[PDB]
Amino acid sequence: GCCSDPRCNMNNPDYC
Amino acid sequence: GCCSDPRCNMNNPDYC
What we know:
homodimer; mainly alpha; 31% helix; 0% strand; flat; acetylcholine receptor antagonist
């Protein structure tokens, strides 16, 4: 998942 | 933060 991966989470505030 | 960058900002319209 994206939100469970630090870098993806950091770049996706709309969903994370 | 994400919103300070044009690409990330545009990918996150709800939050940015």
